[PDB]
Amino acid sequence: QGYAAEISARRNAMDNASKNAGDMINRYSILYNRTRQAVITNELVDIITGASS
Amino acid sequence: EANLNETGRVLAVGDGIARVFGLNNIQAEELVEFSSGVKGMALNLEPGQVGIVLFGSDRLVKEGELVKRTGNIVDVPVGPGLLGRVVDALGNPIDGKGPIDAAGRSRAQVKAPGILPRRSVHEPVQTGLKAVDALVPIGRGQRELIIGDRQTGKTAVALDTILNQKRWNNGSDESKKLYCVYVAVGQKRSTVAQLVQTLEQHDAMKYSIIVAATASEAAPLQYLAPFTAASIGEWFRDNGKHALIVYDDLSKQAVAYRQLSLLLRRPPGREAYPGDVFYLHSRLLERAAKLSEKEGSGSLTALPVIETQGGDVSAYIPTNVISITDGQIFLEAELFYKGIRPAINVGLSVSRVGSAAQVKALKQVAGSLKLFLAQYREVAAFAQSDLDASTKQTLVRGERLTQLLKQNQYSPLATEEQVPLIYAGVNGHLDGIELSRIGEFESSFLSYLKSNHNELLTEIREKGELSKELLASLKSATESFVAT
Amino acid sequence: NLNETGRVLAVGDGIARVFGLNNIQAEELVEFSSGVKGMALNLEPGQVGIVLFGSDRLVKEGELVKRTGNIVDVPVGPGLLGRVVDALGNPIDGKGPIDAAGRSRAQVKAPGILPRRSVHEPVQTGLKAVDALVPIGRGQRELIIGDRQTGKTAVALDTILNQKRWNNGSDESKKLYCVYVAVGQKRSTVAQLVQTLEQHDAMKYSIIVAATASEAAPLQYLAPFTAASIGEWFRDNGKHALIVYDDLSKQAVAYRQLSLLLRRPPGREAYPGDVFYLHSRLLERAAKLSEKEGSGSLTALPVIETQGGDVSAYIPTNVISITDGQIFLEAELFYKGIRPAINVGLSVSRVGSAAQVK
Amino acid sequence: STPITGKVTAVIGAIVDVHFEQSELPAILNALEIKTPQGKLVLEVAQHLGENTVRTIAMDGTEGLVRGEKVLDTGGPISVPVGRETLGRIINVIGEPIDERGPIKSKLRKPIHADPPSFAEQSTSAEILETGIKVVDLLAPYARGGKIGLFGGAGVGKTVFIQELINNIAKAHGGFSVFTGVGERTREGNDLYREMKETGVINLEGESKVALVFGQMNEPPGARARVALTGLTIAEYFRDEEGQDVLLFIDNIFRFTQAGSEVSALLGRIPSAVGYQPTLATDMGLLQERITTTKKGSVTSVQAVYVPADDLTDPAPATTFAHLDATTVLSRGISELGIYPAVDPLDSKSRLLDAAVVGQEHYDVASKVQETLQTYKSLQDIIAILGMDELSDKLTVERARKIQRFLSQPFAVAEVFTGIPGKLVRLKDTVASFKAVLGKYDNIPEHAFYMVGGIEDVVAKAEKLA
């Protein structure tokens, strides 16, 4: 009963974990793009700026 | 009488580009010859001056030099005369085997085949690689990208393909033959030389043509290399024959065209690449196609190579090519060290045509093989503790299926030697064998077939399909070897 | 006559285009009629690019510009000890003139390969982690890299303070004089530091060259160079000097201003193309001379500021590939209790035990 | 001799404009000289701007240069002394003894700008170069006549790495060796000269086995962007004209393209990605291509490559990779474990790792070593969340903390870093040593394979129970 109440508690413990891992994989996912778009733009600004001469 | 119409004076020179005054009656993308001897092609036709890109060292050119027109757009001699010859980006010999008898010439920039004169890809290009022919089949006229990272086997894969072609190029039937064209763009001469000698020790160099635009040679040469070569092979397509061209590699051609455009004072784009960095690769690849029966039914298959940095495949150039090719073949470093060779990520590597351009005999035995592994990869993590029954067996299959997909270099297998090894896998006649001897199983099993069941192989080779009586006899031959 | 003079074609932003100066040298010093000094950097065919050292309003159109015949140079010697001077060498602490023992140029080439001895003489910072894990050597270049408010200057400062044990002693060879180069900082701060130095009786063996943010861009540009010259006199004369560049990130900032206003093409992050050369020729000057030359050394402790703990940045990477070491101070370890917040994993001293106490 | 006069038109930093008369303009790549009170200023013709004007790149800081000075064309590229007399002498980019030992009794002088061997003059040869280091010799073998190169950022210990190679290989090598220091630390460049003299490789009165070419970072870009070519032309002569085995060391090669970046903008070019130069794959090409093995002689190159911010995607390390036959990637993560060198076994790959090259056995063993490792990097996520308890695979997961430690090799050069006496293992020994471990030698946990020689050393280090 001890290792049965545990397995029944581990499923619970990690169902909240996968869900909590969701507010991360998708939260920082947006932050990756917010950085990718800003990388391509800033990487392109230096080129345009140094092309005006 | 210097009339400025065919003659020109160098207004300025440097950065590998020469601004020239005059040359009034010149065409765009036309070649010109300098007093020094080295030549160049004119890209920028500005009002007063004309921008020419040098094919050699800019030192040779000086200010106030004389420039004469050639009257020729970038063109290269084509025909069978190149088969077994190594030429530069211009069609010039560099192997030292003497001049090259040309069966006519063709521009470097040729319009792609229309929408009407094309035929549904159905003729297969047997690579000889178990993982490739089974999982990601390549069709004639198709365009399968060989995408991956440095030192993963991108070239190793493309090479074995050219090697397996011996089975037909030594034959009499021209409709089954498949001439090859290897475009070395950026590679160092050492490597290109290394490649040739390797193709030589396999007698596959007699039906191949190597175009060499090494890292030493000028940028325009590496820019033209693919286009030029695309013509060399396009000759075969136009005459009812089949040709396979490998661009090793397109990632480096892009850089080359970037170098040209940047110096020519052209508007830069994302990551320095000019605007038409996509139209560059689009022009090229869309030239490869399988013509309709109307004209010749000839096919030009293309296997472009992209060198990806750190695995990133969302970069500008990489994603660009991908969105043009009719499928991708990915190679991971992870699997490469793990022991899986060729290291193919079936989860990402997928052909568009696929089934239609595969041997019907192979399509029958490996229909579910594609799925099996797709589900095996996700269940692979369950290794870390107890297995029921539904996932107890899945872990048994794939664990030896991929172990069988392992194939050593320079050892292409015929489709007649593939189906037996794939039948044993998918159906599950190998599930009960220790992995340690699965490798040696491939050999001993194939030698057992060739010796005792020679007939069973010769009907698959010739028919290419598996009949009810045939496939049944296949099972018996298999379970017979499982005992001994 | 245009040979030695020139009239201003246009002026602004500390930049002054001048017509003439047909015999001007590159990087030559120039004086204006209004009093403000300048410097030639662009010897263009038609005109001349000149960076001012002072205000702009002083210069008008058609104003007469003289030559100096001098390449930027500064007074050097022992007299500077206990004093505070600007980037030009002039005393700013208002304690009378300085005793000039010679004038060494600001653009001094680094000692070649031959006249050099392997660094072996330790520089005791008194700081446990530092001396214990990443010891500093005389002639060695150890960089203090980290974000703001991590106590970068702190580690540097304490080093100067600890050297008191040897500066008040008798043996000159055991002495290690100090040179502090305040660049981009505010005048209020430089006034706080000196207050702390004289509270440990350390000003006597320290020389402070400060080009505060208020001062013109060029003044922050030469600041480290002119400061290196100050510490070179000790190197050239069998004595030991230790120079601290703080802050270096602000020097490059200034140099970017010069170049962008002179209209020189930008490189990465707008920074000029030769921004790596900016710190290469600067830090190389710090070295341990040979025994034939007097075994005089110059220890450099460059300080660079990173944003968001990003060492992968442009400038940070440059200076890193220059120095023979790196003390990376993290902000996380700082508030967690570890002070100084040295990160053992990222910090190393290439010299190593070679210049440590047995 | 026909002296050509010129007038300095403009000077912006290190970029000098020189004017000439009609039809007397020196070609690009040529050398121009300017007499200065202190000495001589050397310039390199870069481009013909028009109206009889040329743009040049300074070889020495043009600080003090007066407008309209008289420039004298030399006729060709900066010619450097080449031949036997070049041995045991440190010369700069321009080509003059900076080791302060009088002039060089050079017979010939060849230009630094020369066209690389053609495709036909190539020599396909795969010979294994035995070094000594286990983590390299086995998993990634150097190629005699091939182009080796080590990558890595600062702090990985590259300059200390190539120092071990010189002691082991250079003395064993039966021929000439040429060292070229580009844009690296001058003090450490001095430690090399201080070392090789006491080593017996450099003798001021006796035999000089190696030549030296320096152009450290403290010098302007123009010189650092060319000093790589100066050392090249020297070793190049010992390949063809001398008919002997050559050995070329570059440090650092990254400073070559880096120097090209500085000038690129100044010269008036539209900057490329990551602020580099539009001509990066061709500059690297027109350099590396000259370092090949021909029918005349062979050249074994060991190039040190610096990685900006340890970012392997940087166009600098990127373009260099494709030129090397073998690599030895240095990572900051491996040294923090204790294992020296800091060689990353999962990015260092040589094209000599072939069954038909090092021997079937060699390859077989080398493949097992690689298999055991990768799984860690991927299966590690289980260890950070639980450890080694869910491992079923369980015998192979532990060999990672044993094999990885056994890769470490002690050196004699780095005595002021550990104080631990060095060890030099050979080729065959490392092979037979690993096969046994791959778990026979699974009895001794942790230390016993740490900083030891071959396999006979492991036995003597297991005795002293720690």
Side-chain angles (χ1 to χ4, degrees), chain B residues 12-13 15 59 63 150 188-190 197 216 259 265 337 341 384, chain D residues 25 28 30 48 51-52 116-117 124 268-269 282 325 346-347 363 390:
Chain B
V13 67
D15 289 348
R59 173 186 180 91
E63 176 185 352
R150 60 182 177 272
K188 58 182 181 62
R189 272 161 177 163
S190 307
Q197 194 176 52
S216 173
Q259 172 180 331
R265 288 289 182 264
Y337 305 110
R341 302 181 182 184
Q384 284 71 31
Chain D
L25 303 161
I28 302 83
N30 277 7
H48 288 228
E51 300 188 50
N52 304 319
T124 56
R269 295 176 181 173
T282 56
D325 298 325
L346 297 179
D347 197 299
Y363 185 86
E390 282 69 19

mmCIF file of all heavy atoms in Angstrom, chain B residues 12-13 15 59 63 150 188-190 197 216 259 265 337 341 384, chain D residues 25 28 30 48 51-52 116-117 124 268-269 282 325 346-347 363 390:
data_model
loop_
_atom_site.group_PDB
_atom_site.id
_atom_site.type_symbol
_atom_site.label_atom_id
_atom_site.label_comp_id
_atom_site.label_asym_id
_atom_site.label_seq_id
_atom_site.Cartn_x
_atom_site.Cartn_y
_atom_site.Cartn_z
ATOM 1 N N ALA B 12 39.038 51.945 -63.837
ATOM 2 C CA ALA B 12 39.519 51.577 -62.511
ATOM 3 C C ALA B 12 39.555 50.061 -62.362
ATOM 4 O O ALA B 12 38.886 49.344 -63.105
ATOM 5 C CB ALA B 12 38.638 52.195 -61.436
ATOM 6 N N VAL B 13 40.339 49.577 -61.403
ATOM 7 C CA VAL B 13 40.445 48.142 -61.162
ATOM 8 C C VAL B 13 40.829 47.847 -59.714
ATOM 9 O O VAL B 13 41.588 48.595 -59.095
ATOM 10 C CB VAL B 13 41.465 47.480 -62.112
ATOM 11 C CG1 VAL B 13 42.873 47.957 -61.796
ATOM 12 C CG2 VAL B 13 41.375 45.963 -62.020
ATOM 13 N N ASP B 15 39.662 44.877 -56.114
ATOM 14 C CA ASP B 15 38.656 44.045 -55.461
ATOM 15 C C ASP B 15 38.174 42.914 -56.366
ATOM 16 O O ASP B 15 37.114 42.335 -56.137
ATOM 17 C CB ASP B 15 37.467 44.893 -54.998
ATOM 18 C CG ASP B 15 37.811 45.790 -53.826
ATOM 19 O OD1 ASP B 15 38.889 45.595 -53.226
ATOM 20 O OD2 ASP B 15 37.004 46.686 -53.501
ATOM 21 N N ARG B 59 45.736 41.575 -60.275
ATOM 22 C CA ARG B 59 47.049 42.157 -60.522
ATOM 23 C C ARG B 59 47.300 42.323 -62.015
ATOM 24 O O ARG B 59 47.778 43.364 -62.466
ATOM 25 C CB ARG B 59 48.141 41.279 -59.910
ATOM 26 C CG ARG B 59 49.553 41.714 -60.262
ATOM 27 C CD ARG B 59 50.574 40.722 -59.735
ATOM 28 N NE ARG B 59 51.941 41.121 -60.055
ATOM 29 C CZ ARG B 59 52.702 41.872 -59.266
ATOM 30 N NH1 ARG B 59 52.230 42.310 -58.108
ATOM 31 N NH2 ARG B 59 53.936 42.184 -59.635
ATOM 32 N N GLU B 63 45.128 50.059 -64.804
ATOM 33 C CA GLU B 63 44.305 51.176 -65.253
ATOM 34 C C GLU B 63 44.684 51.582 -66.671
ATOM 35 O O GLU B 63 45.862 51.596 -67.026
ATOM 36 C CB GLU B 63 44.454 52.371 -64.308
ATOM 37 C CG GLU B 63 43.705 53.615 -64.761
ATOM 38 C CD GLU B 63 43.976 54.816 -63.876
ATOM 39 O OE1 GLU B 63 44.628 54.648 -62.824
ATOM 40 O OE2 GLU B 63 43.536 55.930 -64.233
ATOM 41 N N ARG B 150 28.920 19.680 -41.086
ATOM 42 C CA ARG B 150 30.273 19.342 -41.509
ATOM 43 C C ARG B 150 30.676 17.952 -41.035
ATOM 44 O O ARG B 150 30.346 17.550 -39.920
ATOM 45 C CB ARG B 150 31.264 20.370 -40.961
ATOM 46 C CG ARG B 150 31.279 20.453 -39.444
ATOM 47 C CD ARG B 150 32.232 21.527 -38.952
ATOM 48 N NE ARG B 150 32.198 21.656 -37.498
ATOM 49 C CZ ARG B 150 31.360 22.447 -36.837
ATOM 50 N NH1 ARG B 150 30.478 23.186 -37.498
ATOM 51 N NH2 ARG B 150 31.402 22.500 -35.513
ATOM 52 N N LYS B 188 38.809 22.204 -51.734
ATOM 53 C CA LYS B 188 40.226 22.384 -52.023
ATOM 54 C C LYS B 188 40.706 21.310 -52.994
ATOM 55 O O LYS B 188 40.280 20.157 -52.915
ATOM 56 C CB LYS B 188 41.055 22.363 -50.736
ATOM 57 C CG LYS B 188 40.917 21.090 -49.918
ATOM 58 C CD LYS B 188 41.730 21.176 -48.635
ATOM 59 C CE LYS B 188 41.622 19.900 -47.816
ATOM 60 N NZ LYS B 188 42.150 18.720 -48.551
ATOM 61 N N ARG B 189 41.587 21.698 -53.911
ATOM 62 C CA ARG B 189 42.071 20.795 -54.955
ATOM 63 C C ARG B 189 42.446 19.411 -54.435
ATOM 64 O O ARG B 189 42.136 18.401 -55.065
ATOM 65 C CB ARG B 189 43.245 21.426 -55.708
ATOM 66 C CG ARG B 189 42.813 22.280 -56.885
ATOM 67 C CD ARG B 189 43.897 23.243 -57.326
ATOM 68 N NE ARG B 189 43.482 24.009 -58.498
ATOM 69 C CZ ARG B 189 44.063 25.130 -58.909
ATOM 70 N NH1 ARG B 189 45.090 25.632 -58.238
ATOM 71 N NH2 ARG B 189 43.611 25.755 -59.987
ATOM 72 N N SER B 190 43.114 19.372 -53.287
ATOM 73 C CA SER B 190 43.488 18.112 -52.657
ATOM 74 C C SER B 190 42.297 17.160 -52.604
ATOM 75 O O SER B 190 42.381 16.015 -53.050
ATOM 76 C CB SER B 190 44.011 18.363 -51.242
ATOM 77 O OG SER B 190 45.042 19.334 -51.245
ATOM 78 N N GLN B 197 40.593 9.909 -57.787
ATOM 79 C CA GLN B 197 41.320 8.656 -57.616
ATOM 80 C C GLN B 197 40.440 7.580 -56.985
ATOM 81 O O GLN B 197 40.612 6.392 -57.255
ATOM 82 C CB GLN B 197 42.576 8.871 -56.769
ATOM 83 C CG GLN B 197 43.552 7.707 -56.815
ATOM 84 C CD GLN B 197 44.823 7.982 -56.037
ATOM 85 O OE1 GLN B 197 44.779 8.369 -54.870
ATOM 86 N NE2 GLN B 197 45.967 7.782 -56.684
ATOM 87 N N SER B 216 40.465 28.262 -54.471
ATOM 88 C CA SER B 216 41.519 29.112 -55.012
ATOM 89 C C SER B 216 41.002 29.970 -56.163
ATOM 90 O O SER B 216 41.186 31.187 -56.175
ATOM 91 C CB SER B 216 42.703 28.266 -55.483
ATOM 92 O OG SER B 216 43.664 29.061 -56.154
ATOM 93 N N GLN B 259 29.931 37.482 -52.535
ATOM 94 C CA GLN B 259 31.192 38.196 -52.709
ATOM 95 C C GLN B 259 31.154 39.085 -53.949
ATOM 96 O O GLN B 259 31.633 40.220 -53.926
ATOM 97 C CB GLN B 259 32.353 37.204 -52.803
ATOM 98 C CG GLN B 259 33.689 37.830 -53.174
ATOM 99 C CD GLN B 259 34.808 36.807 -53.243
ATOM 100 O OE1 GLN B 259 34.777 35.788 -52.552
ATOM 101 N NE2 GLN B 259 35.806 37.075 -54.079
ATOM 102 N N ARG B 265 28.798 46.756 -55.596
ATOM 103 C CA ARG B 265 27.957 47.805 -55.030
ATOM 104 C C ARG B 265 26.472 47.526 -55.239
ATOM 105 O O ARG B 265 25.717 48.410 -55.647
ATOM 106 C CB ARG B 265 28.329 49.166 -55.622
ATOM 107 C CG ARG B 265 29.657 49.714 -55.128
ATOM 108 C CD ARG B 265 29.561 50.143 -53.673
ATOM 109 N NE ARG B 265 30.811 50.712 -53.180
ATOM 110 C CZ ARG B 265 31.728 50.029 -52.504
ATOM 111 N NH1 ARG B 265 31.538 48.743 -52.238
ATOM 112 N NH2 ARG B 265 32.836 50.631 -52.092
ATOM 113 N N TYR B 337 28.272 9.437 -34.661
ATOM 114 C CA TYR B 337 29.201 8.901 -33.673
ATOM 115 C C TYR B 337 28.607 7.669 -33.002
ATOM 116 O O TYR B 337 29.327 6.742 -32.630
ATOM 117 C CB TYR B 337 29.544 9.955 -32.617
ATOM 118 C CG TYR B 337 30.071 11.254 -33.182
ATOM 119 C CD1 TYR B 337 29.309 12.414 -33.130
ATOM 120 C CD2 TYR B 337 31.332 11.324 -33.755
ATOM 121 C CE1 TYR B 337 29.784 13.605 -33.641
ATOM 122 C CE2 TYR B 337 31.817 12.512 -34.272
ATOM 123 C CZ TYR B 337 31.038 13.650 -34.211
ATOM 124 O OH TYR B 337 31.513 14.836 -34.722
ATOM 125 N N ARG B 341 25.352 4.594 -39.597
ATOM 126 C CA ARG B 341 25.875 5.141 -40.844
ATOM 127 C C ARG B 341 25.259 4.436 -42.049
ATOM 128 O O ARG B 341 25.309 3.212 -42.145
ATOM 129 C CB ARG B 341 27.401 5.025 -40.878
ATOM 130 C CG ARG B 341 28.092 5.727 -39.720
ATOM 131 C CD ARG B 341 29.603 5.606 -39.807
ATOM 132 N NE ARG B 341 30.262 6.232 -38.663
ATOM 133 C CZ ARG B 341 31.580 6.332 -38.521
ATOM 134 N NH1 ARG B 341 32.384 5.850 -39.455
ATOM 135 N NH2 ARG B 341 32.093 6.918 -37.448
ATOM 136 N N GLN B 384 14.682 3.824 -20.044
ATOM 137 C CA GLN B 384 14.847 4.153 -18.632
ATOM 138 C C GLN B 384 13.551 4.684 -18.028
ATOM 139 O O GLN B 384 12.532 3.995 -18.018
ATOM 140 C CB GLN B 384 15.976 5.167 -18.435
ATOM 141 C CG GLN B 384 17.375 4.577 -18.550
ATOM 142 C CD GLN B 384 17.736 4.185 -19.971
ATOM 143 O OE1 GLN B 384 17.281 4.803 -20.933
ATOM 144 N NE2 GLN B 384 18.565 3.157 -20.107
ATOM 145 N N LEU D 25 51.882 53.533 -63.537
ATOM 146 C CA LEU D 25 51.253 53.027 -62.322
ATOM 147 C C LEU D 25 51.703 51.605 -61.999
ATOM 148 O O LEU D 25 51.625 50.717 -62.847
ATOM 149 C CB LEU D 25 49.730 53.064 -62.466
ATOM 150 C CG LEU D 25 49.105 54.426 -62.781
ATOM 151 C CD1 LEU D 25 47.698 54.264 -63.338
ATOM 152 C CD2 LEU D 25 49.103 55.317 -61.548
ATOM 153 N N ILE D 28 48.712 46.145 -58.930
ATOM 154 C CA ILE D 28 48.240 45.729 -57.618
ATOM 155 C C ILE D 28 49.189 44.673 -57.063
ATOM 156 O O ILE D 28 49.868 43.985 -57.825
ATOM 157 C CB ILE D 28 46.808 45.156 -57.685
ATOM 158 C CG1 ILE D 28 45.839 46.186 -58.270
ATOM 159 C CG2 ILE D 28 46.337 44.714 -56.309
ATOM 160 C CD1 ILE D 28 45.826 46.235 -59.784
ATOM 161 N N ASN D 30 51.888 45.062 -55.780
ATOM 162 C CA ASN D 30 53.250 45.588 -55.790
ATOM 163 C C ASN D 30 53.613 46.269 -54.476
ATOM 164 O O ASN D 30 52.742 46.576 -53.661
ATOM 165 C CB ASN D 30 53.458 46.557 -56.955
ATOM 166 C CG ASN D 30 53.777 45.845 -58.256
ATOM 167 O OD1 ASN D 30 53.725 44.618 -58.334
ATOM 168 N ND2 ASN D 30 54.113 46.615 -59.285
ATOM 169 N N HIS D 48 43.511 50.399 -58.140
ATOM 170 C CA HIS D 48 43.668 51.565 -59.002
ATOM 171 C C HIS D 48 42.384 52.387 -58.994
ATOM 172 O O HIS D 48 41.390 52.011 -59.615
ATOM 173 C CB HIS D 48 44.015 51.127 -60.426
ATOM 174 C CG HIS D 48 45.405 50.592 -60.573
ATOM 175 N ND1 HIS D 48 46.256 50.996 -61.580
ATOM 176 C CD2 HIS D 48 46.099 49.693 -59.834
ATOM 177 C CE1 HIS D 48 47.410 50.363 -61.461
ATOM 178 N NE2 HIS D 48 47.340 49.568 -60.408
ATOM 179 N N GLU D 51 42.240 58.104 -62.585
ATOM 180 C CA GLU D 51 42.987 59.342 -62.767
ATOM 181 C C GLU D 51 44.428 59.179 -62.294
ATOM 182 O O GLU D 51 44.984 60.066 -61.648
ATOM 183 C CB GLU D 51 42.313 60.498 -62.025
ATOM 184 C CG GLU D 51 40.888 60.780 -62.477
ATOM 185 C CD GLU D 51 40.320 62.042 -61.856
ATOM 186 O OE1 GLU D 51 40.996 63.091 -61.918
ATOM 187 O OE2 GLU D 51 39.197 61.985 -61.310
ATOM 188 N N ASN D 52 45.018 58.030 -62.614
ATOM 189 C CA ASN D 52 46.414 57.750 -62.287
ATOM 190 C C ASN D 52 46.702 57.760 -60.788
ATOM 191 O O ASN D 52 47.750 58.236 -60.352
ATOM 192 C CB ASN D 52 47.337 58.734 -63.007
ATOM 193 C CG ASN D 52 47.135 58.726 -64.509
ATOM 194 O OD1 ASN D 52 46.974 57.670 -65.121
ATOM 195 N ND2 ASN D 52 47.142 59.909 -65.112
ATOM 196 N N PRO D 116 49.012 29.087 -56.222
ATOM 197 C CA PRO D 116 49.046 27.729 -55.672
ATOM 198 C C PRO D 116 49.195 26.678 -56.763
ATOM 199 O O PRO D 116 48.822 26.930 -57.910
ATOM 200 C CB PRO D 116 47.670 27.595 -55.005
ATOM 201 C CG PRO D 116 46.822 28.627 -55.695
ATOM 202 C CD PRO D 116 47.762 29.773 -55.859
ATOM 203 N N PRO D 117 49.737 25.503 -56.408
ATOM 204 C CA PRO D 117 49.912 24.398 -57.353
ATOM 205 C C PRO D 117 48.617 24.075 -58.089
ATOM 206 O O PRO D 117 47.538 24.152 -57.503
ATOM 207 C CB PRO D 117 50.306 23.229 -56.447
ATOM 208 C CG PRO D 117 50.964 23.872 -55.281
ATOM 209 C CD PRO D 117 50.226 25.161 -55.061
ATOM 210 N N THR D 124 47.950 12.991 -54.126
ATOM 211 C CA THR D 124 47.080 12.286 -53.194
ATOM 212 C C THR D 124 47.865 11.243 -52.404
ATOM 213 O O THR D 124 48.254 10.205 -52.941
ATOM 214 C CB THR D 124 45.908 11.599 -53.923
ATOM 215 O OG1 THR D 124 46.419 10.724 -54.937
ATOM 216 C CG2 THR D 124 45.002 12.636 -54.569
ATOM 217 N N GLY D 268 37.113 50.551 -48.372
ATOM 218 C CA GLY D 268 35.879 50.934 -49.032
ATOM 219 C C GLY D 268 35.131 49.740 -49.589
ATOM 220 O O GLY D 268 34.994 49.591 -50.803
ATOM 221 N N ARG D 269 34.652 48.881 -48.696
ATOM 222 C CA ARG D 269 33.864 47.721 -49.092
ATOM 223 C C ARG D 269 32.610 47.617 -48.234
ATOM 224 O O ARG D 269 32.627 47.964 -47.054
ATOM 225 C CB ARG D 269 34.688 46.439 -48.962
ATOM 226 C CG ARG D 269 35.883 46.348 -49.900
ATOM 227 C CD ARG D 269 36.676 45.080 -49.626
ATOM 228 N NE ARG D 269 37.846 44.945 -50.488
ATOM 229 C CZ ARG D 269 38.762 43.992 -50.350
ATOM 230 N NH1 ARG D 269 38.643 43.094 -49.381
ATOM 231 N NH2 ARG D 269 39.798 43.936 -51.175
ATOM 232 N N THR D 282 37.703 33.225 -50.409
ATOM 233 C CA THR D 282 38.712 33.286 -51.462
ATOM 234 C C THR D 282 40.068 33.733 -50.921
ATOM 235 O O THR D 282 41.110 33.354 -51.454
ATOM 236 C CB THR D 282 38.287 34.221 -52.609
ATOM 237 O OG1 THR D 282 37.991 35.520 -52.084
ATOM 238 C CG2 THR D 282 37.064 33.670 -53.322
ATOM 239 N N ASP D 325 42.449 18.662 -43.266
ATOM 240 C CA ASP D 325 42.308 17.217 -43.405
ATOM 241 C C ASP D 325 42.029 16.582 -42.047
ATOM 242 O O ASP D 325 41.378 15.541 -41.955
ATOM 243 C CB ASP D 325 43.578 16.609 -44.006
ATOM 244 C CG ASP D 325 43.867 17.118 -45.404
ATOM 245 O OD1 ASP D 325 42.904 17.365 -46.160
ATOM 246 O OD2 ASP D 325 45.057 17.268 -45.749
ATOM 247 N N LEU D 346 34.129 14.750 -29.625
ATOM 248 C CA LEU D 346 32.903 14.670 -30.413
ATOM 249 C C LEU D 346 32.782 15.792 -31.445
ATOM 250 O O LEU D 346 31.678 16.171 -31.833
ATOM 251 C CB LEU D 346 31.677 14.649 -29.494
ATOM 252 C CG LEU D 346 31.576 13.439 -28.561
ATOM 253 C CD1 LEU D 346 30.341 13.531 -27.676
ATOM 254 C CD2 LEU D 346 31.574 12.141 -29.359
ATOM 255 N N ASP D 347 33.922 16.315 -31.886
ATOM 256 C CA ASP D 347 33.953 17.323 -32.943
ATOM 257 C C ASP D 347 35.294 17.267 -33.668
ATOM 258 O O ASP D 347 35.455 17.833 -34.749
ATOM 259 C CB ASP D 347 33.702 18.722 -32.375
ATOM 260 C CG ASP D 347 33.320 19.730 -33.447
ATOM 261 O OD1 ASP D 347 34.133 19.976 -34.364
ATOM 262 O OD2 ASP D 347 32.204 20.285 -33.366
ATOM 263 N N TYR D 363 40.700 1.206 -36.257
ATOM 264 C CA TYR D 363 39.383 1.766 -36.531
ATOM 265 C C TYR D 363 38.310 1.165 -35.625
ATOM 266 O O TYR D 363 37.500 1.889 -35.045
ATOM 267 C CB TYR D 363 39.018 1.535 -37.998
ATOM 268 C CG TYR D 363 37.716 2.169 -38.424
ATOM 269 C CD1 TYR D 363 37.670 3.490 -38.849
ATOM 270 C CD2 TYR D 363 36.532 1.445 -38.407
ATOM 271 C CE1 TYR D 363 36.481 4.073 -39.240
ATOM 272 C CE2 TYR D 363 35.339 2.019 -38.796
ATOM 273 C CZ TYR D 363 35.319 3.332 -39.212
ATOM 274 O OH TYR D 363 34.133 3.906 -39.601
ATOM 275 N N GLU D 390 18.326 4.484 -12.982
ATOM 276 C CA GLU D 390 17.344 4.032 -13.959
ATOM 277 C C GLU D 390 18.023 3.406 -15.173
ATOM 278 O O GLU D 390 17.366 2.797 -16.018
ATOM 279 C CB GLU D 390 16.438 5.186 -14.393
ATOM 280 C CG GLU D 390 15.354 5.540 -13.386
ATOM 281 C CD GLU D 390 15.905 6.173 -12.122
ATOM 282 O OE1 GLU D 390 17.056 6.658 -12.148
ATOM 283 O OE2 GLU D 390 15.182 6.191 -11.104
#
